[PDB]
Design a protein around this ligand. Structure first.
Ligand SMILES: [Zn+2]
Ligand SMILES: [Zn+2]
Ligand SMILES: [Zn+2]
Ligand SMILES: [Zn+2]
Lengths: 131, 131, 133, 133
């Protein structure tokens, strides 16, 4: 799968921009469209923890608000010894908007990475089929 | 894996008790503790859709509020032609409280079932390790 | 008396502080939701390693009650280890508006016996409802 | 004038109604969040097949703005296709309290030009804050 350095940079650079005054645990994201346009995400906490929003979802909400519907890659980065794991809530938003086989790159500290896909992160994904 | 009919019944019976005035899409859950005690869950919607709570999480919140910390099975049921899929948010709550290999049974209409586990529904799960 | 019952509901909400699952914030919140039939449901906040999946004590109480078929609520008590009475967050206030009458009383509790009397409508003015869906 | 700028923010929030991702409720909500520097951020509600993962228009606007480093907000407009001015839900009100001054004005819009003037404090009285964490 294609992986551009600007996408890695976008997700890592977001770590310094996250709004995490309660966890001090920043997460950054780079969501790529078919046209090559990049959307950066950060996690954004709330004094009521349950209203916290993840970096991956921030990037999707940005892109989707600008009318983007065709996504080709997602990079997620953390200050973690192994590649950062997206939480299950984010995996469900990725399934809403991405193809099962759309590539995902997970990044940690000191250059560690893990290559995966939407389907491998959320197998047997719930969809709108039966609503 | 052990599977008792009362657990299937508990999840299916919950379908008639769900609070789903907006989707009319009921989901039911049966969460089993080590002691054999059963906790039933229903999905519970809100006029602001984002405040909706899933049946699986309702069962965990019930059990955890009573001090339960040892879970041995989860059944989830829907009025669906294939076994109901837990959403990614629920999968993340299951990972908070359950062993990776704890069995999960998914049920649909006309007796269709799917046997899986917490780890298979949420691979490479995010944990508190690096907070 | 209504004041004596309210003291027992306050005690239930305060006991919930010891039951909370808050390994990340270490900030417990307790709730006591009271039904028309006299049954009480105790709530705790329940955190998740992914903070956004945390559930508040008030919502835990409502989800417990609603899962048992309760639809008629008469009082809600919320307690924290706070110098002033604890404030319910906006998300909880929206779940209260889903299930409770606007004039339902809510009692907020802090440390050393401090309390504040309010209602669902006072906590969430001009509340969003299902009317236009 | 402040009233003329507010009309343009209202227009931005109303245009967002056409941009919303609401394939389940078919109930669009639009937002226009205004910064101290004059920059605006448009929000839409964005639903999910699992309803609980839906994000409101107001929060979409805040998450867009905060991700670009914005921390100083001067106005928020929220619009719906509603006969009375649309009400922000409690969850959105709590995110507004995280980032906005209590006296920040909020303009609520409905169909046929109906508006309601309020503030963050009026929408979320006795707001929960970080003070005790
Ligand atoms: Zn996440
Ligand atoms: Zn779920
Ligand atoms: Zn709350
Ligand atoms: Zn909202």
């Amino acid at each position: 799968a294609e992986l551009k350095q600007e996408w890695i940079n976008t997700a890592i650079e977001a770590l310094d921009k996250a709004y995490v005054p309660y966890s001090h645990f920043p997460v950054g994201a780079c969501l790529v469209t078919e046209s090559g346009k990049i959307y950066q995400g950060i996690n954004i906490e709330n004094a009521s923890f349950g209203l916290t929003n993840c970096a991956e979802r921030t990037a999707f909400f940005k892109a989707v608000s600008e009318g983007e519907r065709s996504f080709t890659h997602l990079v997620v980065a953390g200050h973690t010894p192994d590649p950062i794991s997206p939480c299950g809530a984010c995996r469900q938003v990725m399934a809403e908007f991405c193809a099962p086989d759309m590539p995902v790159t997970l990044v940690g500290d000191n250059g560690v990475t893990k290559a995966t896909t939407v389907r491998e992160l959320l197998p047997y994904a719930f969809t709108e089929k039966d609503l």
